[PDB]
Amino acid sequence: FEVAFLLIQWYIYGFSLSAVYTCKRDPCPHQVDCFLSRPTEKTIFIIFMLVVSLV
Amino acid sequence: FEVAFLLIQWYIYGFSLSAVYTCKRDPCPHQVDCFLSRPTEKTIFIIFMLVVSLV
Numbered sequence A, B: 001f002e003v004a005f006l007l008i009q010w011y012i013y014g015f016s017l018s019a020v021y022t023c024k025r026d027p028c029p030h031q032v033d034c035f036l037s038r039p040t041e042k043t044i045f046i047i048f049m050l051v052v053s054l055v
């Protein structure tokens, strides 16, 4: 259960977060720019919870 | 002067007007949709002034 939950997160998300996202869904016209909330503080806590599950 | 002014308008504009324009300049992000004012009434008067200059 520890290995299987680490492989789903590597496939879906990765292990960081960027500040600007580019979205191509509907009803939005062509492509839009969207901005995230605290993308640097969240990246620090993603790496803290990776080392805990590897130990 | 009548022929030279008809060839510049055929090259720049054409002889009609559409309702939705797609713009790719700066500072706009990617591509946006822009909407014109009375695009059908103006197309009727573009063709009236074409027949006058051809007669």
Ligand SMILES: CCCCCCCCCCCCCC
Pocket (backbone or CB within 6 Å): A001, A004
């Ligand atoms: C151990 C509990 C995890 C259950 C896994 C079931 C599959 C999860 C979906 C797989 C991702 C699909 C993305 C297209």
Ligand SMILES: CCCCCCCCCCCCCC
Pocket (backbone or CB within 6 Å): A040, A043, A044, A047, A048, A051
């Ligand atoms: C955008 C720059 C992010 C910098 C990431 C720094 C992460 C430090 C986390 C320390 C984890 C160590 C656990 C013992």
Ligand SMILES: CCCCCCCCCCCCCC
Pocket (backbone or CB within 6 Å): A047, A051
């Ligand atoms: C320069 C940006 C680096 C971002 C990742 C930093 C990770 C360093 C911390 C590793 C902790 C390992 C503890 C065993």
Ligand SMILES: CCCCCCCCCCCCCC
Pocket (backbone or CB within 6 Å): A015, A016, A047, A051, A054, A055
């Ligand atoms: C952007 C991703 C950076 C990942 C760097 C951290 C890797 C963790 C290595 C140390 C793990 C300690 C296991 C005991």
Ligand SMILES: CCCCCCCCCCCCCC
Pocket (backbone or CB within 6 Å): B001, B004
């Ligand atoms: C008879 C007066 C017309 C003057 C014509 C001078 C050239 C006009 C510009 C040509 C179009 C350039 C588009 C790139």
Ligand SMILES: CCCCCCCCCCCCCC
Pocket (backbone or CB within 6 Å): B040, B043, B044, B047, B048, B051
């Ligand atoms: C979008 C549909 C536009 C229909 C254009 C109709 C143009 C009629 C103009 C008549 C010109 C005749 C001059 C004698």
Ligand SMILES: CCCCCCCCCCCCCC
Pocket (backbone or CB within 6 Å): B047, B051
């Ligand atoms: C179906 C849309 C047709 C649009 C153009 C119509 C132009 C017809 C009028 C031509 C006038 C010619 C008078 C000599």
Ligand SMILES: CCCCCCCCCCCCCC
Pocket (backbone or CB within 6 Å): B015, B016, B047, B051, B054, B055
């Ligand atoms: C969308 C453009 C339609 C143009 C149709 C009208 C062409 C004009 C033909 C009649 C001209 C009369 C000259 C004497």
